[PDB]
């Protein structure tokens, strides 16, 4: 049951990737899945159903005109335009797979992206000033979406799983996503509806397969899938965000996952991984795979 979820962000969002200064326009599926898990914990909702039966897609840009998917990692027989071309409208993406997209149209598609503007807020901490100290400045990354634009993701699951996702997203609207939430950022409104277009892209048969979410297979699946693939291996690191985990905040175990949009000739099922070390509760990372079939 593929459901399109569209997030329109009222206030700017941080969506940090490596620091507080930098801001990402989107987030990977692991971040959204962690937010869903946190929300289910707050709402006293079971985690097993969400962990097992739910496979979600990375968040991707969309405008009033087009919904943008990640550029597939396929061989190109100029190249700077394709490097600049990160997202392709779904109708254009099938043409890109067919290889009809030239460099000029690639640059035109890349400039067509009007997701929003990335800024940097400069803030201070005045806590030391009271205790005979000096204030200290810092910076928070931000990304403000244009009024028509927003982010979206596709989620597949059982009917009960979809309803639980609806409730969790209704709560996440006010909980927020990204960094420096509960400090002025990350507030969004969500709308979940079935999308015929996405279902048409979902149902497809091709020689090649492309990830829609950041994922990594188990070793047994890795042996078969790794061969004949073009992928980007991205590191997923972070600090645990919980009160129950430890007395003081502890970093998560470093993970490495195939970036969304990577092309595998052999598909692999995803696995929910545990990046906890010596903690009171296991810290979950989402590495399940959302697949699109294409022909090159």
């Amino acid at each position: 049951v593929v459901k399109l979820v569209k997030l329109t962000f009222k206030s700017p969002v941080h969506f940090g990737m490596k620091r507080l200064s930098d801001s990402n326009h989107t987030i990977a599926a692991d971040t959204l899945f962690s937010a869903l898990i946190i929300e289910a914990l707050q709402q006293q909702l079971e985690l097993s159903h969400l962990l097992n039966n739910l496979v979600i897609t990375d968040l991707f840009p969309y405008n009033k005109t087009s919904y943008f998917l990640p550029k597939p990692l396929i061989r190109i027989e100029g190249y700077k335009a394709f490097k600049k071309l990160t997202y392709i409208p779904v109708e254009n993406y099938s043409e890109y797979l067919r290889g009809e997209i030239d460099s000029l149209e690639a640059s035109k598609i890349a400039e067509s992206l009007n997701l929003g503007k990335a800024s940097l807020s400069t803030k201070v901490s005045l806590q030391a000033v009271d205790h005979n100290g000096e204030s200290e400045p810092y910076s928070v990354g931000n990304f403000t979406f244009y009024p028509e634009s927003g982010l979206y993701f596709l989620a597949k699951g059982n009917a009960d799983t979809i309803g639980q996702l609806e409730i969790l997203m209704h709560a996440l609207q006010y909980s927020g996503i990204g960094g420096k939430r509960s400090a002025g950022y990350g507030q969004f409104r969500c709308t979940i509806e079935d999308s015929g277009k996405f279902d048409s892209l979902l149902s497809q048969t091709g020689n090649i397969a492309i990830l829609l979410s950041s994922a990594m297979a188990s070793d047994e699946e890795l042996v078969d899938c790794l061969e004949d693939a073009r992928y980007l291996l991205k590191k997923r690191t972070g600090f645990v965000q919980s009160k129950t985990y430890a007395d003081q905040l502890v970093k998560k175990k470093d993970f490495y996952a195939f970036s969304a949009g990577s092309t595998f000739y052999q598909k692999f099922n995803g696995k929910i991984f545990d990046v906890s070390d010596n903690g009171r509760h296991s810290v979950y990372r989402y590495a399940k795979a959302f697949w699109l079939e294409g022909k090159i």
């Binding site: 070793d219 790794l226 291996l233 970093k251 470093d254 490495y256 070390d277």
Partner: peptide
């Protein structure tokens, strides 16, 4: 690849 995810302890 299996080496990267085989790290045992993240570190304080």
């Amino acid at each position: 690849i299996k080496l990267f995810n085989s790290t045992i302890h993240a570190g304080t």
